[model samples]
Target chain A: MQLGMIGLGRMGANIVRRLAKGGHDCVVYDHDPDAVKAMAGEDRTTGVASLRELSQRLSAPRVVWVMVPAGNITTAVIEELANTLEAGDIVIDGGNTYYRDDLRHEKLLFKKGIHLLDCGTSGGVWGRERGYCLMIGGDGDAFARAEPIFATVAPGVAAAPRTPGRDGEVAPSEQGYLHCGPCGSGHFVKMVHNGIEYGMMASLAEGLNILRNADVGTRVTAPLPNPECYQYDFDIPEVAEVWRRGSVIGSWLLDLTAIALRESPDLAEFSGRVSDSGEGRWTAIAAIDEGVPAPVLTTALQSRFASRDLDDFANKALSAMRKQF
Target chain B: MQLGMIGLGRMGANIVRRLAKGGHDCVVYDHDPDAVKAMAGEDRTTGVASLRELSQRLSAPRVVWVMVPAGNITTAVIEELANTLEAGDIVIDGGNTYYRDDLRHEKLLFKKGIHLLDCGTSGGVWGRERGYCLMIGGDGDAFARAEPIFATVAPGVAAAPRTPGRDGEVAPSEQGYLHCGPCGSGHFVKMVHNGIEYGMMASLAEGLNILRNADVGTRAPLPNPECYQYDFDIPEVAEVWRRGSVIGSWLLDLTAIALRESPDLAEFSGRVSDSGEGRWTAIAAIDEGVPAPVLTTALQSRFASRDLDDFANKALSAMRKQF
Candidate 1:
């Protein structure tokens, strides 16, 4: 199927290459001369100079994929495409725009007799070998129009491998991706996935720090009363080793931790200043608005924000009860 | 390998069964007569009427394993064993007593030359089928002396499987067991494992409620925005399905939600209650002492302590703060 692709960044270029290779006709347009010139169709693809040019090249009832940043960039592209592109034409917005904005875009496009689909794509620097988790949301017609593109890009699309239990050492499944639902559902799932990533990462960080600080394997220097005392051999390496096996928490992160342990004698000096993109913050805000007591996810988001600060923001928000233990 | 076995509970009975079947001459004594009488080691493994009878049956170098409650019961049992048994004898506390208490017990037994070994065992109800994760701390000599018993009860002992982690699918090696470390290290890991469990459970609970409140597949009533406006799909079944798939959380409570979704939607009567058996709370207390920001874990623990009437407590706590 022939389609027009807007925006020419790293993600856009990669999609162009993948689609072109998969034998789909790709009519791409980028403002940058170099990007536009490089991506022009030779064997079976075509490149256009502008959104107007791309629309003119495609047949009636056209399907275009927009790969631009969230907010204004995507909004502007969609607005321009809605005018230039005719009625009955469908457009797929493949970006990390807020789900609410996706719904807004869908409604706007619907009024003009045009179909709009919001696709949440998730493959980072390594995408060609490792396919992206493409979350698609739209009406049945719009979804059917975009199926070819998703199939070519998803790792698990062609064939899904079997996944083993926590004890079993099955590799990370290609099936880690999901279609989710209609409208903004795709982006919403992706957002929550990222939020969960934050919590798991923060929890991992805490466990790492605890093992480091306690000087695991050393005999307790002091004693306490009763059966609830904390004086025991806190073997950091052994704990990781044991958990890596039968524990319900056996995951990819644990695999990374094990590899990191081989480098450091006592699991020391991990980057305390870990960075988090906006998905976690979005999840945090949603959790609050919905009155959901999702502490792990929210705290993980907060932990990232706190990590960004070089010094404590004492001037801003301070409450005595914050330390009530 | 004659040893005195006190507290013939489930763990004790299983250990006795395995040990007796594997040809270890051991004497058993329990507070309950029925417990002792039911043991397979009636002939080879004699049952002692009391601790006094246990002392008479076993030699001076007696090694008794006490599998009972932690706290006062453990203390009383150990104190009695310490008094009745002579200096050369050794006692193993094979319960989930806190690791710090292990050091104290070791110190107490050191004076009489009657060594105490704190062995953290974690096979749970399935220990016999799956060899337990054993962590022991005490005298090095005592560890050396008990080596044969550990070898016998461990993975390849007699009828026990040749290898661990082979219970279900023999593909990936999890062998469900480990020695861990000395003394309280076993219990420490156990405690922390439970703590992690608490946080994971709370996270799932909160996630479930959020999804449930969201009217999935249906439009929100007039004044509300589109479904996409909401952060997540509110359909509880759909949410639970996606969560159970490859994206399943660390919370084992995933099963509970799945079962709940099966009938009448959910047994959770909207009103949530928590039994403070929360390990996250213990973790929070520990983190506070360590000056660590266990924000995620601590917050989950705090959520458990919340209730409908707790609005008053919240107000009080809030007013207690000036800023």
Candidate 2:
């Protein structure tokens, strides 16, 4: 199947390469001429200069995947593509665009007889080798047309059957790519997925932090009579590696954590500050809007903000209280 | 190797069974005669009536593991074992005793020239099939003495060479059993492991709960035209994730269990009392002056459950409508 992909950023380039490896004809375009020329050497994919050139490259009833940054760039590309491509052609937004924004984009493209798909792609830097997990939402007919593209890009096939939808509708497939309900549902699910990721990350990091500081209480006090009687120095990486096998908390995130700890003992090079993508915040707000008790996820988002600050006023006040006593 | 084990409760019995399967001769004792008789059927194990009889059955420099509940019961058993066993004998407490208590027990037993091994064990109900993760803390010599037992009981051998311990100390083979450090270190590490478990479990449960109620917004809404439609069927989502996804975890096992209970867990009867060890973990965090918001909040969530249905869901629902 032939596909037109816009943007040649790291993710965009890797995705095209993956599709090419899967034997799909990929016509790619980017604003940077160098980025466009770089892929020209690849036999499976052709590089084009503009949206019009990309539009002309693909055959009728085309599927064009937009892989750019979320805000204005994504908006501008989708808007321009609506004018560049003919009716019945499909556009897929494969970035982390706000689902609410996706709703508006779908409506704009709908008027032009073009289908818009909100695809939530997961599997970070390793996606090229391991394949991506795609959550897609759009017209039923358009989903059917792009099923082959989805099959190639997504990770392993689903092992079991998916539960039926609310209205007795069966899921599109029990595979990696899910046509999650309507236009915005895919991003909505992806947003919540990120929110869960924040909560999970915080849980693991906080746990390891507790373990890192485990023997602190004994350390500050008097030394023991026997030197060997001192508190244990926990090897953080060892603990993580042990848990990876039979423990209930084992996962890909933990696997990465074990790797990270092995690379750096205290991770001293890091500033202890964490940056959040908007999805976590968006999901937190959405949870509040839905009357959900999401303290773990909500606190995780707040903790990231708190980490950025150097002077913790509360800690200072507590210290002052101890002195006064 | 020959060993004596006191207490034939669910955890103790399974452990003895595992040891028997591993080819160790085990002398078992329990207050309940039926429990003792149950393990008597297994080969490589003998049931004894009294603590003296258990001591007499094992050879010199014996390893007797106490697998009773924490608190007074554990205290009494160890006090009795201290008298029954001779000098150079080892008493391993393979239960969830407080680290402070373990320290106290170690001091008491140290006076008698008996080594106390505070062994923290974790693997739950399936420990027999899948080996337990053992964190041992005691005299380094005693740990070396019990290395054979630890090797047999702990899960898979370490995949690669372990990083050298702090201070150039070689790590005890990169296996499931780690001799953490001095006495109480094992229990202390185990305590924190449970604490993290609380945080991780709460994080998973809260995420699933939010998804279970996701469709609530759609059922009661006016014509906004663009309501940003979503109501992810959580069971379907969870099952999909269980297979090779980034978020896949052992907690997924519990998630499936919760879903299997009822489609709507809110409709099911739940006392929601999360009990104690997690609380101890919370206290440990506060004492350490560590910022553990996720685990701390996770404990808080459990406490809220014990408060009964004071219309928490309703209050949240009311807030949701206003927004």
Candidate 3:
């Protein structure tokens, strides 16, 4: 029942607070002195200064949840845990690590008796209220053992069998997540999901821009000639809300878009330059290997990469060939 | 209205039938005598012996609709029509003539005071009952004058708002047709639509193939999976039928796939070739010009054109490498 929580960033802290309130015994650790001291001050929680101290504090067959940045920190943390943590213990990598890393980590830990899981955890800060969509991939035995933890962290049973809602309908599994496959598949699916999200978002942005430029007489709420009317009628607080019901698009990224929209009227402040974790490129490379036309997905990732450049060479060429309408 | 109809192919014959059924006298002539005779035998349509007879039968202020193959045939037919036909008469190129040709033809016809309307007509053999997605571009007055014919040939008011029985959803416009814009815009939109269609079809084909390869476990429908099942559902037609509902995917291409499947199950007999009209190349050029990564559309077109030895050679070589 006791879970050892590592990393005390924004996500890690929220998870600890949510888990503690949910009545799970938490042994937490972080490198930040302020974070460790603040968590130690909180009641019903034991905070250790070091990873070893935290590992020692947790009983045998301990379960540690890693909520750190994807690359070196995660790899180092896992390597450390694998050395100190006893066999039958479990390590859950719940970050944006490449799926390939999950396979490597799983194989390495599997050689020892310890279990490793690559969990695709979705839902941002508000995840505490709206439970995270946990896409889990690991040994079936490890999954079975960690079922109770997933039950605690994930949304209620009422959230299951998610049907068409107000704006658009997403696959219920998108909300519930899944045990995609053995190690690496969870992150693979998540990476693909994000890549899809990028394409869809860019498409919506491009379509909106084109419509705006074309003056296509599209009517939206608020007399703006934008589709905001279609969005506003449902009292959509986020882009995801509009994408739901009204359209066939429903994804976690759309949910984030909706949430971001409530804060910004134009939804333009967020930098168009979307930084990709290797997972998207990995998925695209895999798709290329498989001969699948992962165009929308690949283009989405590339669009983000291309957005960082300021030359606007294409636009300039378009301007040169502009028609005087 | 007396209208001279050229080319008695599937579309031309059907148009003649619709016009004749509407009580408009159509002096129809085809290069094939049997086709002309067959149409002459049908309802109110009369067959003319030649283009001269067509011009003679149809009096002044005549409107001739040229329905022929795109490239060379279109040019030959137009040249013949221009030679025989008098000025002040209008000509409608009802065939899938390139919009660029339409622009040039419009100027040529304008010099002789003859109007040219480049109309993009959709709906194949089923056009008689179902009506057609008509895209007309030219003089607004000419389009207005041709309203009666357009109305008679096109699906009636009931045809515009389609009610899907399975999804119980109405396509805002039942007639999947739009009068896009003037000049090249109609064909431009149509071309882009085709390009989009190519990507969608390719994706669907690829997705279905993946399903065939995937161990979908309980979700796998049939024990015996034919490769063409990657395109259409044979044993369970309803499986394919159900896809027509809310999953309003790129289902139109399945018609061509089905036709190929009917003769050769593996599509072994058919060459995987694309009749690259304009859109695919235009979209590719647009992507190159606009710097938009329209990979799916571009790649699908390239893939369609990959029957060329060099492309095939590159493809075979590319696949041989292993990590």
* Model 2 residue A138 CA deviation in Å: 1.4
TM-scores for candidates 1 onward, in order: 0.45, 0.48, 0.46
The true-versus-predicted C-alpha distance at residue A25 of model 3, in Å, is 0.4
Give me candidate 3's TM-score against the actual structure: 0.46
Task: Evaluate candidate 1 and give its CAPRI docking class based on DockQ.
Answer: incorrect
The per-residue C-alpha lDDT of model 1 at residue A59 equals: 76
Give the interface RMSD of each candidate: 12.3, 10.7, 9.8
Output the better candidate (2/3) by DockQ. 3
Worst 10 residues of 3 chain B by lDDT: B282-291
lDDT of 3 at A247: 62
Q: Model 3, range B95-172, lDDT digits (tens) per residue?
A: 877778888877777777777867777778888777777777777777666656666667755754444353654331
Better of 1 and 2 by lDDT: 2
The list of candidate 2 runs beyond 4 A from truth reads: A158-174, A221-230, A310-325, B1-323
Residues B1-323 of candidate 2: C-alpha lDDT, one tens digit per residue:
99889987878888888988889999989899988998898988797899998899988989999999888999999988888988989888999988889989998898888999999888888788778888889899998898888777777554345554534544444567898999999888888888888888887788877776655545544545344356777777778878877556778876776776765666755445553566566556433334556675776676556553246667758767843
